[model samples]
Target: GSSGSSGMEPVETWTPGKVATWLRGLDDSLQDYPFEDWQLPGKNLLQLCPQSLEALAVRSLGHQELILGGVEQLQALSSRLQTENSGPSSG
Candidate 1:
């Protein structure tokens, strides 16, 4: 199962522009949904902040694994930014 990360990074989707539009449409009345419940199978929950950062956690792993994996994802995405644009990565 998925675990929480301390960094409080925002999760996002693989679909380009999907998360951006979703956030842009949110109003002050938007309710906070638990990260785990919003995810699809194989895909973990992504935490997207109003600032536009994406966060993701692997659902199949334990707590420690989740944190570690999230870090890895974050780093990988960072690396990608140096070379390309788009797709999932740490937020």
Candidate 2:
């Protein structure tokens, strides 16, 4: 099978449905969360907090980490994307 980085980039490139797909893959329990229905974008997802997640039906313990924890990886990606778009991190 042909695959390059599996064709994945930063989460910002992901759409709301794509976000749902990735989350479900991250945590099978995410099914009930129905992220697609929320129609939340990947970039917007990072802004969600513990309370908002529970409000969205994500039971903390709760692969909510799937969001917040995944938030770290996403944030990391965003920083890198910014650096690449702007200039090197070193000044």
Candidate 3:
């Protein structure tokens, strides 16, 4: 049975400042990452080793792009799955 949306909690809204703060408090010892200053109200900066920082920056950018591509793939899969299941059509 499908659960009604009324019982679902709303998604959390996050500002850049909040994300910066969250990045700052992350475990410093993780991969010896070089920390970057996030020039936000909290002066939040992420810590990482210089090499790790470069790699992480690249990875983050790649992930952002990947998510855009993944969205289409996921929508296609969802449609296929729903059709295969012979489920009720809410559409």
Candidate 4:
């Protein structure tokens, strides 16, 4: 079986600007959001959750879904990478 890349780089290594850029890529309307100006508590966009998104005043269902979907994709990729890195390898 051949494995294919998701074509997304790891989010852990991304800067706030990069995260914002990716989000904007999802929807241009996201540019109106304060992702660039607002200082994340720890400067980690991965810390964002649905509730936090709500707190950020993201009221549009379409925006919420798109942003949340991106977050989930990043998380899934992170988990997959961790598993592969820790699993036994046939040396």
Candidate 5:
């Protein structure tokens, strides 16, 4: 199974069920929202930002924050990995 270092799993491999499950994990009340039905247009789950979530009709500020937080965390981790990989190597 393909995976990311963040342990959130690669968004490319996520099914609709997995997406719904992830949203629910952020907040149980998210169960009422149909995250699986929301389209990301040309983007993937990892590309989800607060504005995008809002566009998907996520009205609760708390839910938006939670989702945004997760996205930010993934971005941070990706940045850190990129920096580490580009660092000088002792060859």
Candidate 6:
């Protein structure tokens, strides 16, 4: 778990540039976020709360909903992966 052999960078470990690219992909042909200029990293993306998202001031399909859902989707995936790797035993 220390590193990956493949060149695959998980959403949880992407840089700002990668994050921006990914976001654009999420809603290409529509709107764009200030992530790149804002220097948003995956660490930030993954941990973003609704309040934090509100602060972004996205300068719309459903862009808000799309972004929110995208975040939640990956958030769940990442959490599942993490929890799957560790067992918490409570008696």
Quick one: best lDDT, which candidate? Answer: 2
Q: Give the deviation of candidate 1 from the true structure as CA RMSD.
A: 15.0
Superior candidate under TM-score, 3 versus 6? 6
- Cα RMSD to the true fold for all candidates: 15.0, 5.0, 12.1, 7.1, 5.5, 5.9
Against the unseen true structure, what C-alpha lDDT does each candidate score? 0.35, 0.69, 0.35, 0.65, 0.61, 0.67
Candidate 1, residues 1-91, lDDT tens digits: the string is: 4446453323432333333333223432222323334433212224323232223332333433433444456444434443335455668
Per-residue lDDT of candidate 4, residues 1-91 (tens digit): 4337554455665566556567658777787887676545323566677676777887778888877777776766654545535643558
Candidate 4, which segments miss by more than 4 Å at Cα?
1-9, 41-43, 81-91
Inter-residue clash pairs, candidate 5: none
Q: Cα deviation in Å at residue 23, candidate 3? A: 1.0
lDDT of 4 at 20: 59
User: Which regions in candidate 5 have their CA more than 4 angstroms from the true location?
Assistant: 1-8, 39-43, 76-91
TM-score-wise, the better of 1 and 5 is 5
Candidate scoring better on lDDT of 1 and 6: 6
Range of the 10 consecutive residues with the lowest summed lDDT in candidate 2: 81-90
lDDT for predicted candidate 5 compared with the true structure: 0.61
Clashes of 2: 0
Model 4: lDDT of residue 15: 61
Model 5: per-residue lDDT, tens digit, 7-73? 4434544565566666667777666787667644322667766676777787678877777777666
Off by over 4 Å in 3: 1-12, 29-91
Tens-digit lDDT track of model 3 for 37-82: 4323221112222344344453454433433343344334333434
Model 6 per-residue lDDT tens digits across residues 9-88: 45677677777777778876324556568678888888876666666774233666777778888766555445546744
